[PDB]
Amino acid sequence: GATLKGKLHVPFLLADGKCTVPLAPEPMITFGFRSVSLKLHPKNPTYLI
Amino acid sequence: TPVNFNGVKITAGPLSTAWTPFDRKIVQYAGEIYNYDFPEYGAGQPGAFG
Numbered sequence A: 001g002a003t004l005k006g007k008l009h010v011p012f013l014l015a016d017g018k019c020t021v022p023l024a025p026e027p028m029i030t031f032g033f034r035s036v037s038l039k040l041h042p043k044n045p046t047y048l049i
Numbered sequence B: 001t002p003v004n005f006n007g008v009k010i011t012a013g014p015l016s017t018a019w020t021p022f023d024r025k026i027v028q029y030a031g032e033i034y035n036y037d038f039p040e041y042g043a044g045q046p047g048a049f050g
Helices: none
Strands: A028-032 A035-039 B002-005 B008-011 B026-029 B032-035
Antiparallel strands (some): A028 A035
């Protein structure tokens, strides 16, 4: 028969907040005519965009 | 430099080739030698040897 007897809430949902994220050690930049050569030393796999 | 035994003198003259496997500047680590052009003292850069 019909069995739906009620609803009950689900806790611990995703909520917005602030999370600490690391900074990779600053690039070493060298300049040239219409050229920028930056040396990078990741501590973790890091994106360059 | 000579050497003298029992009357005979032996003299090892200069080698016909002055080749050496080690370059001008090398690195020793863990009992092994490396041909590495390391920076001179005070000029080492971050993220590299020295």
